[PDB]
Amino acid sequence: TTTQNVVLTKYGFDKDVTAIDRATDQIWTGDGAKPLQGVDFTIYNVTANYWASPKDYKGSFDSAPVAATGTTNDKGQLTQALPIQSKDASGKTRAAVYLFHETNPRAGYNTSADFWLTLPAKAAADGNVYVYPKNVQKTTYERTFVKKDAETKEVLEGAGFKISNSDGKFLKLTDKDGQSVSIGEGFIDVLANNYRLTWVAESDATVFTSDKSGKFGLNGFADNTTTYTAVATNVPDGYDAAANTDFKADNSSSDILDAPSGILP
């Protein structure tokens, strides 16, 4: 019959800050750390795996049934009621053991290590068992471009670009689950939207487009050492296609110029 509520809360910290551990009976607000939404966990029931030989259990969830799955909400939380008792491989009732496995980290963050515990666990005053897995922020990189009229030097809205890598593959943004998303004008905040960068054929690539300040680009690049190329695909009427622009994700902004098309007598 009986279950305990396990409340998992996922907080992000500055890269050089390492949270102190919290007991399961303590409610911790995160002290200003940012809650991480959209992070997927699978909870495995490893009762049988552990009780086959407790002193040898090193975290295997091979063949373990899935007790639950979830995704952190806006508060960084997922809550799951778990049976405090479960059966081992021979059918005998035992204290249940559950292993928490992060299957999909937030963009810009490392995954957290697998952890496990026995129930019932020490609970807070409200009866819930609180866990706070650590996800360390990894440094990522961004790039901004400003489209301008080569003659007037004024910013130019509505210019379309695709991005290519050294293999001739082009950038496609997806959501956390790998599905298509609708990208508009401007700088795309990959980190804030929890998007992914993928590399595909030119025809399926994402088009980035200069906004009303001429701006386009994105964050969430893995490194600042690889060369990519911005290639004009949509040219505003009355301009000549900008030349390809080689770049690195180096957190800079730089201008891409469009020459007004010349009309001769």
Residue numbers in the entry: 38 to 302
The authors write:
As the first reported host of “non-pathogenic-derived” pili, Lactobacillus rhamnosus GG is a gut-adapted commensal lactic acid bacterium (LAB) and one of many clinically investigated probiotic strains for human use in the prevention and treatment of certain gastric ailments. As with other Gram-positive bacteria, sortase-dependent piliation in L. rhamnosus GG (called SpaCBA) is assembled from the ~30 kDa SpaA (backbone), ~20 kDa SpaB (basal), and ~90 kDa SpaC (tip-located) pilins. Our findings show that the GG-SpaA structure has certain features in common with other pathogen-derived pilin-proteins, such as the Ig-like CnaB-type folds and the presence of internal isopeptide bonds6940.
Although the E139A mutant had been isolated using the same purification protocol used for WT protein, these conditions resulted in protein degradation when E269A-substituted GG-SpaA was purified. This was remedied by modifying the purification buffer. Here, this allowed for the recovery of intact and pure E269A mutant protein in both a monomeric (E2) and trimeric (E1) form, as evidenced by size-exclusion chromatographic analysis. Moreover, the overall topological similarity of the E269A crystal structure to that of WT GG-SpaA, and including the molecular arrangement in the asymmetric unit, is high (RMSD of 0.4 Å). Surprisingly, electron density for an intact isopeptide bond is found between Lys184 and Asp295, despite the absence of the glutamate residue at position 269. Surprisingly, the mutation of E269 in the C-domain had no influence on K-N or K-D isopeptide formation.
